């Protein structure tokens, strides 16, 4: 399917 | 239309957490402003004692906190400064990450 991904910090 | 708050106020958001599933073991809050990227906020573990991540830009002036009695996880933002005007969003979270597969509009005066 598909998503967005917020990556959590450095 | 949104929230209007003056520089150094503060906002309360909150969002539904259904809890933790094979898929998510959290929730969280990203932003977006106007003609910038998504960015994240924060983070936080159904686990007690397990994650709370914060973007270094909202560091000790958000707080993020859950209540799995009341299936519900909170975003205290406090000394909101006019770099806060955004879009904010809650998404369920894997070890962090947010996944977005109804936003709240928050504009700051300086």
């Known amino acids: 399917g598909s998503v967005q991904i917020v990556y959590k910090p450095k | 239309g949104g929230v209007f708050v003056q520089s150094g106020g503060s906002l309360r958001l909150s969002c539904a957490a259904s809890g933790a599933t094979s898929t998510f073991d959290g929730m969280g809050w990203f932003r977006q402003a106007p003609g910038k990227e998504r960015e994240f906020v924060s983070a936080?573990?159904?686990?007690?004692?397990?994650?709370?991540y914060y973007a270094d830009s909202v560091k000790g002036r958000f707080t993020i906190s859950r209540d799995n009695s009341k299936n519900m996880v909170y975003l205290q933002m406090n000394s909101l400064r006019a770099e806060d005007t955004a879009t904010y969003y809650c998404?369920?979270?894997?070890?962090?990450?947010?996944?977005?597969?109804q936003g709240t509009q928050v504009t700051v005066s300086s």
């Open positions: 998404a369920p979270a894997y070890e962090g990450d947010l996944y977005a597969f």
């Open positions: 936080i573990s159904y686990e007690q004692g397990s994650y709370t």
